[PDB]
Design a protein around this ligand. Structure first.
Ligand code: WC1
Ligand code: WC1
Lengths: 341, 341
């Protein structure tokens, strides 16, 4: 599982080289290409690489083994790195928008002295790097246009999701009438599930010559449902997870997030409870965060979650049973195993 | 010339409609699509539309008149609007990065109450709209991939140019050792000339079935040279233009810009003059801006410019003479006329 990750990371060095080869081919833009290198190195490294690696794993599980030459494998690693660049673009930009301080345990790029709002253009460069790598490595392949369109569409979906989230949950303005279940699912589907789960498997599919509309739709159905549970579990763990196991010490409640937890809370709350939420949700003070968390436990949200994880796992297994064919079920089950661990 | 502009603007209403049709096809994301509409309407309208209109004018001059049906013309307007969306994406983002207050005589989008840094995601949406329109209108055409690659490449070039500019001219830090002629030309070529002049004519060329590498290179040579003079003239007019004729009251000097003017000044300045520049360039006070402007006139920069405009016009005419064929020279001469007016 995580021997493949060392191999993925070692490929980065070449991605960076080929993207910053213009340091001397046109000398004039050298300093800009040096800055691009620093942007790539700071923002594309330090994550867990789950999205990029999924491209490689899924590719190897989908392609006939005697069409896995060195050049094929290299295209798969490169396209994995494209998914990671897309992720990096979103995170740099989201951090600016949310005023975050840290990411992946280090200062956010935009908070670095000397960067600041220049990070907006750095993020656009990271995005642009995707299409430069696609062209460099995949332009003669029959799936080239399909991949370009898949990355463009995944960016749109994600951005639209971000818009929805920004409207739903503006910092420093509590309005819980916004935090409905239909809205939560919609945010998760567009902002997270499409790029995190559909994108990497679809890309592997296209690379394997699997281009059919119907097959893509079948896999999408499985994968967007998995993505929904992934985010719900992320929301739950934000507050209730062991921090030496997650890494996170959560701030969803302080940040006025449309969390699965606040959604559930609101569905179950008496009016006296709605009031406790109104007075304490989306504020900085520890005692106020304690209040919300106490309210969550009083309503047995951990028991709700555990039940919800069980029903969700059965449903995902049924979706796999119904929609995986003719793909090998292992493509989806590998993901299910990680998510439901 | 400017009857065609009313026609271009009237087409916007349909661009907006087709991009925000999802307001009821998926109801969940309705509020986000409403926000997209407001972003489009505020940021794609209010400019002079020169870049988009160039696509339409050049298309009509390049295509055989009995391949200009209603659907062709519509694709040309749409692709013109794509160039305008690309422009809108860059301007929204640049305004945030520069901390500007106004644009096109109105408050900058990000300065609107309630927007703020959410404009970063608004800008990404504007970019994404380009590829949604290309797909909606041009996906079955033989030039589809060529246009997608042209817009992606124009975005990269522009972003790289912006990086170079940000490194060269950081606000609140005067360093004139950066402001060399080689650097100025490099910024202009990447940040301005490619998207403003090459992009719209190249797009019209691809739409007319003119896809040859050689022809694109020939036209690019003419067009990047024209773009260089356009920006130089913009820099000159920033300070010396009549504001009821430009619209601008200039702030290049206050903003520590790598202007053609400061570059020229530096080439001609004694060390005592270099000092006046060092002490007064890139500062807010009116008397300090007066100093720089006085220095410019003492070195006869307006006479240098006028001479430079003459040599530049002859050179552009020679480039047209040598590189326009087999395109009709009118494609380039229309631009020359506007630029050198
Ligand atoms: C390590 C676990 C404590 C944690 C809950 C987890 N579980 C996962 C299950 C699946 C995936 C995943 C797999 C493929 C594509 C995208 C995500 C990531 C995570 C992750 C890590 C996620 P997270 O940090 O939880 O949002 P990342 O965005 O990949 O870093
Ligand atoms: C109106 C003039 C006082 C002014 C100097 C001018 N001259 C031009 C010449 C050519 C073009 C142009 C033509 C095609 C593509 C791009 C620009 C724009 C301008 C412009 C307007 C430019 P500007 O505002 O000068 O940078 P815009 O970016 O199109 O608004």
């Amino acid at each position: 599982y995580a021997q493949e990750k060392q191999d993925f990371v070692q490929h980065f060095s070449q991605i960076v080289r080929v993207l910053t080869e213009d340091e001397m081919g046109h000398p004039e833009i050298g300093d800009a290409i040096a800055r691009l290198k620093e942007v790539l190195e700071y923002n594309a490294i330090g994550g867990k690489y789950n999205r990029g690696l999924t491209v490689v794993v899924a590719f190897r599980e989908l392609v006939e083994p005697r069409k896995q030459d060195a050049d094929s494998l290299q295209r798969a690693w490169t396209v994995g790195w494209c998914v990671e660049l897309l992720q990096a673009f979103f995170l740099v930009a989201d951090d600016i928008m949310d005023s975050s301080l840290t990411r992946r345990g280090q200062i956010c790029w935009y908070q670095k002295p000397g960067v600041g709002l220049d990070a907006i253009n750095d993020a656009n460069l990271l995005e642009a790097c995707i299409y430069r790598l696609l062209k460099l490595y995949c332009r003669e392949q029959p799936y080239y246009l399909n991949l370009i369109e898949l990355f463009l569409q995944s960016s749109y979906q994600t951005e639209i999701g971000q818009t929805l989230d920004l409207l739903t949950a503006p910092q420093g303005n509590v309005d819980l009438v916004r935090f409905t279940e239909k809205r939560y699912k919609s945010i998760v589907k567009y902002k997270t599930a499409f790029y995190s789960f559909y994108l990497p498997i679809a890309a592997a599919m296209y690379m394997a010559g699997i281009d059919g509309e119907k097959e893509h739709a079948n896999a999408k159905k499985i994968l967007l449902e998995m993505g929904e549970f992934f985010q719900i579990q992320d929301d739950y763990l934000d507050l209730f997870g062991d921090p030496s196991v997650t890494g996170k010490i959560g701030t969803d409640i302080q940040d006025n997030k449309c969390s699965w937890l606040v959604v559930q809370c609101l569905q179950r709350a008496t009016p006296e409870q709605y009031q406790i939420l109104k007075e304490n949700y989306g504020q900085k003070e520890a005692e106020k965060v304690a209040r919300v968390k106490a309210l969550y436990e009083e309503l047995d949200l951990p028991a709700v979650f555990l039940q919800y994880e069980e029903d969700s796992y059965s449903h995902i297994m049924a979706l796999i049973e119904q929609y995986a064919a003719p793909l090998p079920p292992a493509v989806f089950l590998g993901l299910a195993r990680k998510i439901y661990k």
